[PDB]
Ligand binder design. Structure first.
Ligand SMILES: OC[C@H]1O[C@@H](O[C@H]2[C@H](O)[C@@H](O)[C@H](O[C@H]3[C@H](O)[C@@H](O)[C@H](O[C@H]4[C@H](O)[C@@H](O)[C@H](O)O[C@@H]4CO)O[C@@H]3CO[C@H]3OC[C@@H](O)[C@H](O)[C@H]3O)O[C@@H]2CO[C@H]2OC[C@@H](O)[C@H](O)[C@H]2O)[C@H](O)[C@@H](O)[C@@H]1O
Length: 222
């Protein structure tokens, strides 16, 4: 028999080389729809995958964060020399309100609660916007070959910094650690914090008959 192979459950996952591919439909209760995900290929620190979705309702509420998460031991920033990454992706769908973003977390201890979250958005689609206490940038730095718009704002007892590419970026390669150095140098983030999480995926708000194709994604820590 041939069956649907994509996984669709709220907390379903797949293991793929150095990655976990999470469905992470954490916000599904905020609306109506569904989301199914699958691995296409993998080899060590590289993965190709896709996700398709339709979400309605809860227009300002994220429904999910399907993502490829690197398996690694939490490491203090001052022990990291570079985090090379490459990401090639494309989106299809209608009325897509979503981002394509890295999601990363810093904590005082390896097993402890997060203190900072750092997102790096390669795309803001359909008017999607980052968490921001003002609605405006705090800085507009050039990092890893891209001109970014940096925002900040709270999420519970954490501060979220979001670097948003000036233009939609379907193909990206550079050193993700440059974003952590930037915040250590410019925003008072301690270089003694542990990087606990390195994820790359998409946050949908609303849209229909959407599909993200990640043709290539790689990341490592040196
Ligand atoms: O009992 C059911 C199963 O629970 C699983 O645990 C889940 C928790 O119940 C969820 O609370 C948790 O949701 C978080 C999710 O993993 C993150 O991806 C998401 O990150 C947000 C971030 O908060 C936001 O600041 C940033 O802008 O955007 C990212 C991406 O969307 O955050 C979720 C929680 O925060 C939101 O909800 C609470 C609000 O107060 C807050 O404002 C919201 O933002 O997810 C876990 C599962 O997470 C794990 O798997 C998915 C991975 O992607 C993730 O990294 C892993 O930690 C249990 O694990 C299961 O065993 C249970 O069956």
């Amino acid at each position: 028999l041939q069956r649907r192979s994509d996984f669709c459950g709220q907390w379903d996952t797949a293991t793929a080389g150095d990655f976990t591919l999470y469905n992470d439909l954490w916000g599904e209760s905020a609306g109506t729809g569904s989301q199914c995900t699958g691995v296409d290929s993998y080899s060590g620190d590289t993965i190709a995958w896709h996700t398709s979705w339709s979400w309605s309702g809860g227009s300002s509420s994220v429904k999910s964060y399907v993502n490829a998460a690197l398996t690694f031991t939490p490491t203090q920033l001052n022990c990291i020399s570079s985090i090379p990454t490459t990401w090639k992706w494309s989106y299809s769908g209608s009325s897509i309100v979503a981002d394509v973003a890295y999601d990363t977390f810093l904590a005082e201890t390896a097993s402890g609660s997060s203190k900072y979250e750092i997102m790096v958005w390669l795309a803001a689609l359909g008017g999607a916007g980052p968490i921001s206490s003002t609605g405006s940038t705090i800085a507009t730095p050039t990092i890893a070959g891209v001109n970014w718009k940096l925002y900040s704002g709270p999420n519970g007892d954490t501060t979220v910094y979001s670097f948003v590419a000036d233009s939609t970026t379907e193909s990206f390669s550079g050193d993700l650690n440059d974003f952590f150095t930037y915040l250590v140098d410019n925003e008072g983030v301690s270089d003694e914090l542990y990087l606990t999480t390195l994820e790359a995926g998409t946050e949908p708000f609303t849209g229909s008959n959407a599909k993200l194709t990640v043709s290539e994604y790689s990341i490592s820590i040196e």
